[PDB]
Amino acid sequence: GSGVGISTGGWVGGSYFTDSYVITKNTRQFLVKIQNDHKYRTENIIPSNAGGKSQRCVSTPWSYFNFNQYSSHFSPQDWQRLTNEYKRFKPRKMHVKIYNLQIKQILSNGADTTYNNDLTAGVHIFCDGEHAYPNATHPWDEDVMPELPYETWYLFQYGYIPVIHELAEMEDANAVEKAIALQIPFFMLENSDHEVLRTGESTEFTFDFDCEWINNERAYIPPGLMFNPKVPTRRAQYIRQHGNTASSNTRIQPYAKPTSWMTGPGLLSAQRVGPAGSDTASWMVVVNPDGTAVNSGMAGVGSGFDPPSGSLRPTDLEYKIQWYQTPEGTNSDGNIISNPPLSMLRDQALYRGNQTTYNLCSDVWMFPNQIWDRYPITRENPIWCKKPRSDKNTIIDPFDGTLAMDHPPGTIFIKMAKIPVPSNNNADSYLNIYCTGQVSCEIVWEVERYATKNWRPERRHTALGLGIGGEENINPTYHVDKNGKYIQPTTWDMCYPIKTNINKVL
Amino acid sequence: WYLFQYGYIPVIHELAEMEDANAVEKAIALQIPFFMLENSDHEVLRTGEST
């Protein structure tokens, strides 16, 4: 049986650990409301004192679910157990259900507001698994599923950038900007098939990941340091004459053996630019066809490449990934700054011998025989990113540690059905409704146990590294205080990074 | 029959509070467990359903 008085699902939660795989189960209560007055609009974002930066976006009457982050699928207990007991993991299968939908009418009679049920109202649900439309999600967005299961999950309006604004606008009648503008695409999600659900209906979605592993492995030595210091080498070295010091040809010392392996790539040369309101990055990636007007700075035609560092040790704080732990974080209050994992593949430098000292070269490009580790990711990192479609690319290693995929999990779009109301002159006036429901996400994670011949104990993540916080400062991290506020980790180690624990023999 | 709110004692309070920066009370506090019942599976019923 099914109907108004029958529920379409139940609450799933918790994790399940085995040797081969882990299953995380999460359910949230979500809220969907009418966005953008049920219409598509193309508006300009022109900031003041932004360094000439401007965007043009199409705002849709649609909102979407975003599952991309680890904190949303793992409790701090489960993340600790994951990074302590397993040497690598990747996502395998993802299953999403949307069910127990309640569509309600909003009645504003005055300062008061009352809520009734529209039992025949419905909600639009569309999953784009083919990535036929512009992608809704970007890594490190505020729009992710909540961390704690009992918070309401408010979806965000969907929108996309149809064009570079600086190249589309036509100033003193530019012919090539005229051609850029005429080609600006426009996407409506009503152009495809999707489900419409009433309150007794539910939907489901499955996705199969095909991924590369995420390794948490500590290198105790660099790749250049692996050799026996007591065995002599037959290699010889020639030192050129320097000033009064005579030239020499000699056998290389046993404790210094030349390595065939080299620092990974990274760009340390540049610095951030301009006021905070601009796009401020040491490296700016622009697209500027020939003939365009482009009256602004390069931030207008370009996107900042951050972090530039790669596996090179950041020289300054400008080169480090840092985020805010809550949406209310501002300035230096609530920000978490990446720190070295103390893996010997993650902090690297090249020095260029000038015949007297060594000097750091800031720009290490891609070179043969380079070896490095991927960025150590905490529980607050996004899981995946969208790899853009292109003819050619180099090795794909996003510097934020996300897994780049040709086909990430499809974005699920949700919308309130427009209920129009009559008017003497036909005008756009609709019934004011919203939907709340329950959404569950089950991801199956493939994992691998570790084995080691190391004699000594290894570093693990412990609760004794956590801090104390809250209203009276009597409660620890990952707990709630007097007022129900959740105490956030204040440092990067409290977020339990990967590649800090389990050693590997190179 | 009016049901009562659920609640539990996570810790001994006197040993969790940290006064003049006690090192062992610091360790008691960092270990205080926290339990949400949403961490598990359970039924959700509407008016026609029963358990």
Added chain:
Amino acid sequence: GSGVGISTGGWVGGSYFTDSYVITKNTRQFLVKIQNDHKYRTENIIPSNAGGKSQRCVSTPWSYFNFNQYSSHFSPQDWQRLTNEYKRFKPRKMHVKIYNLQIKQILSNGADTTYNNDLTAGVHIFCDGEHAYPNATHPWDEDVMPELPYETWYLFQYGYIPVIHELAEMEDANAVEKAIALQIPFFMLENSDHEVLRTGESTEFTFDFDCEWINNERAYIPPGLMFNPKVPTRRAQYIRQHGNTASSNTRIQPYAKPTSWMTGPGLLSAQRVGPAGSDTASWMVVVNPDGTAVNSGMAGVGSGFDPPSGSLRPTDLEYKIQWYQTPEGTNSDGNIISNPPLSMLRDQALYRGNQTTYNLCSDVWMFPNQIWDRYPITRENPIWCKKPRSDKNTIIDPFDGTLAMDHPPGTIFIKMAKIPVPSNNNADSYLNIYCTGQVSCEIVWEVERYATKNWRPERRHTALGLGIGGEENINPTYHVDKNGKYIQPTTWDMCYPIKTNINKVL
């Protein structure tokens, strides 16, 4: 094929972890030499300034293997993984091999000493699995298998106490001490069957443990603290009139609810006695039949009961288990003192209300509804002890955390065969020989994974709690220094105690 030039085994080592069980494999090189001039002797140990304490022992020409300790079967890596990933463990099956035996003749021509092979010489090997003889081993002995696999393992001479010395000696012709003496048993291990091996032969032994689990579980609250503070109770309390304060009968407060559970037993009343050379313990367990002479103190007829504390928090250092980490430890150099695990079942007290304050009662005897945790054991603890045969006993919970068994693993005894040499007058003169060989021990340990609904991270054992030591103080615990010396843990937490990590809901 088998013979002089064929080896009888190989080196086994390493651990293997699964969900249900763990297998530890260990091999050592051992040395057996002629003990006690091939004869049984009964000698008195009379110390000076010992508080009248004296022992009489029978020294056999036998030595034995002792496998009882955790450090010998687990590397610090394996112990860490055991106590981090598993909520309980017990030993299941034990398998011992003795093989690759080399018997050599010792030739002393002077200051120099040379070593030849006796290929027809043999070695006696006897395992007592029925415990027909006196037990060779006692917990916390120096005689255990070595911790690091590459150290030679020197066996210790076997000996036993046939009688209480003070009650056997007969002074001014005591009639009951006369009867104690005539009954003193005497045990020769030649009274039974055993194997004799030459260099091409080997032997094996199996033992099946039947045990109670060893739980590593942290209680985050006491058993008396589990209740809802906001729910009122219907219990009432009567407070007697105290001085000017009037008598009252009132409802018990919701935040204080009477508990039906009580402090475990322990004896805090007494103090240690006498000089360090005596048997110094707060509690002395004596056997003194009526009529005996007993001219010494009670230490002569009695054995100290240490630690007395039980689950009660030790009031003084006298009540805490402490040991030395190396045989060279002396005074406060090299000693490790037990600390509270910070489990809420391990530090307990009763207070007796006098109608004004509360006062600690030192002696908590066994009482109904007592609940406590067993002693938290580190990697340096002995695994089992011998439970003595008796008609009646109470609950068996050794305060040092060992597993008491009616039939522990049988002791394997080993002896050099006496090779006599001729003499004009038949006299006791023998050929001077010794045996070195390889002994392996494989124990199968049954284990159990943990699962928790706790949200927050839990304490784990990390290498970042270890210290730095050695010759130049550049090397960490559980490592070797410049001179090959193994850096020992200097604190009790560095020994990774159980019951510090995995929480349990009472």
